[PDB]
Design a protein around this nucleic acid. Structure first.
Ligand SMILES: [Mg+2]
Ligand SMILES: [Mg+2]
Ligand SMILES: [Mg+2]
Ligand SMILES: [Mg+2]
Ligand SMILES: [Mg+2]
Ligand SMILES: [Mg+2]
Ligand SMILES: [Mg+2]
Ligand SMILES: [Mg+2]
Ligand SMILES: [Mg+2]
Ligand SMILES: [Mg+2]
Ligand SMILES: [Mg+2]
Ligand SMILES: [Mg+2]
Ligand SMILES: [Mg+2]
Ligand SMILES: [Mg+2]
Ligand SMILES: [Mg+2]
Ligand SMILES: [Mg+2]
Ligand SMILES: [Mg+2]
Ligand SMILES: [Mg+2]
Ligand SMILES: [Mg+2]
Lengths: 44, 69, 275
RNA sequence: UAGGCCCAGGCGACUGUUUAGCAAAAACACAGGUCUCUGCGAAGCCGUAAGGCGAAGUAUAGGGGCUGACGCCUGCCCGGUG
RNA sequence: CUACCCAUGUCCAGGGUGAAGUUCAGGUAACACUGAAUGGAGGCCCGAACCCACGCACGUUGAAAAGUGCGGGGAUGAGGUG
């Protein structure tokens, strides 16, 4: 039973990473929302 | 052996001006061989190897549409 | 010739293939290649826009002279190789000043013959020269439309076009599809008919053999859902439930001519093709 | 540890693919056949446009529709619709 | 995760059958062909690893939110997989 989550770090950083979030207007919107709510972990 | 001669095109009224330009502009497309000058028209007649009778028939035809067919 | 396999199994039951009677070598020239990767019918957006394409054996592109501009310099045929991109075969030339190029190999030629490419070369297979200096009635291939751009008309294996008379700055030419058309007199052309004419008789034989030429299966329209095609849905094997068979994008596909009406080249087409 | 076999028919020529998790097939695909469009900035397709695939190809090539090895064959109707 | 595509790597114990071609002979008008030897083709055969999922039984607040046991199919390719 090959489950859905196959962990990997390079993929995670290239998809949900910080430098990827600060690469488009929408990503910066996401970061602004996260900051406003006050979360302790902005990106992945 | 040259089913049509140049003198035939000449007497057909196919030399310069505007009336003869209309004559060729009609006749050519009526024969599906496009436009040409006098000599070019004769050469096209030769290369497509069209028969004299059909040429005369289309000639009379276009004269009739000229005369209001 | 054509080699016929003997039916040792259902695979090769009717299969047949060529024999490469003319290929004189098997190793391409090293300094005349270039990378080329297949694209699987995907445009610059990563979207699929051409069905039925993908996969297949890796190839490597050969660079070919379609201009044939080196003139006054007598070349020389060296080999005849096999090109996995064309349909015809290509030959290798050794110009007397040390330069090597590839040429679409016309039928008949073989190693040793000489080549000339100026407006003074004589009428002979292989040679190339502008259309003006070409007598009437001869066959010719590899025609170009704009002067000094390289041939892009009849080019495949076995094809051949014909000259039909001179005019002021245009020439009357009948293409391979029976179409007649005026062409600028300043363009170049290549004498002789493209060789390897037997290419049309080959029988593929089995699914895999077409699979590894980069061709994928095609699903008939009449068996899809109605969501996916104007032919979908039905009783179960139902006929075309419309007034005319239609392409998957809802356009008629029998006799519906598609050439643009306002094309700015109709003043050069004296006799549209017939059949 | 290690093939049950034989005699008859229907379907599909064959190897292959398919409803992850109730359907593995006679369904799909296929080699072959046929019709049709396309003269090159080709036709078609994605995109509002640039830009692309088709193709670093050129009618013995490319797209679309139907049929589906091989053998014997494919009759009559153009009033209606296209 | 799954569908298809692109680039670059990698895996498939063992045994069968014997195409083309070639060489000999016989053979024929040489040919057609016949018979030996060589040769090693194949979406070929049997069968482990590997991949799949045809039958039955069990399980059904399960060992498991799709499995196990005994049999089954492909297994050099339209392969499997990183
Ligand atoms: Mg297609
Ligand atoms: Mg076959
Ligand atoms: Mg269905
Ligand atoms: Mg609909
Ligand atoms: Mg319907
Ligand atoms: Mg079957
Ligand atoms: Mg099967
Ligand atoms: Mg199911
Ligand atoms: Mg079954
Ligand atoms: Mg099942
Ligand atoms: Mg087909
Ligand atoms: Mg391009
Ligand atoms: Mg069918
Ligand atoms: Mg049937
Ligand atoms: Mg009928
Ligand atoms: Mg096998
Ligand atoms: Mg499956
Ligand atoms: Mg088991
Ligand atoms: Mg089997």
């Amino acid at each position: 039973m090959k489950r859905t989550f196959q962990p990997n770090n390079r993929k995670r950083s290239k998809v949900h990473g910080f430098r990827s979030r600060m690469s488009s207007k929408n990503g910066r919107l996401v970061l602004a929302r996260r900051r406003r709510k006050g979360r302790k972990v902005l990106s992945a | 052996e040259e089913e049509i001669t140049f003198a035939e095109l000449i007497e057909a009224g196919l030399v310069g001006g505007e009336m003869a330009r209309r004559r060729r502009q009609r006749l050519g497309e009526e024969l599906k061989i496009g436009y040409a000058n006098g000599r070019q028209f004769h050469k096209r007649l030769k290369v497509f190897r069209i028969s004299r009778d059909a040429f005369y028939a289309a000639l009379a035809q276009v004269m009739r549409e000229e005369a209001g067919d | 010739a054509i080699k016929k396999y003997k039916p040792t199994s259902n695979g090769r039951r009717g299969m047949t293939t060529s024999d490469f009677a003319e290929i004189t070598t098997d190793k391409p020239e090293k300094s005349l290649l270039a990378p080329l990767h297949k694209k699987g019918g995907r445009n610059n957006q990563g979207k699929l826009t051409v069905r039925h394409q993908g996969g297949g054996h890796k190839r490597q592109y050969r660079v070919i002279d379609f201009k044939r501009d080196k003139d006054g310099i007598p070349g020389r045929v060296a080999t005849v190789e096999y090109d996995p991109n064309r349909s015809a075969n290509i030959a290798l030339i050794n110009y007397a000043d040390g330069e090597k190029r590839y040429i679409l190999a016309p039928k008949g030629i073989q190693v040793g013959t000489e080549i000339m490419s100026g407006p003074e070369a004589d009428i002979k297979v292989g040679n190339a020269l502008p259309l003006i200096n070409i007598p009437v009635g001869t066959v010719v291939h590899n025609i170009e439309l704009k002067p000094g751009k390289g041939g892009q008309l009849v080019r495949s294996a076995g094809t051949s076009a014909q000259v039909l008379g001179k005019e002021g700055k245009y020439v009357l030419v009948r293409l391979n599809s029976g179409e007649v058309r005026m062409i600028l007199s300043a363009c170049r052309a290549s004498i002789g008919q493209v060789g390897n004419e037997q290419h049309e008789l080959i029988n593929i034989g089995k699914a895999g053999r077409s699979r590894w030429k980069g061709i994928r299966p095609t699903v008939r329209g009449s068996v899809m859902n109605p969501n996916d095609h104007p032919h979908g849905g039905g009783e179960g094997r139902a006929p075309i439930g419309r007034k005319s068979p239609m392409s998957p994008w809802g356009k008629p596909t029998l006799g519906f001519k598609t050439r643009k009406k306002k094309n700015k080249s109709d003043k050069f087409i004296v006799r549209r093709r017939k059949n």
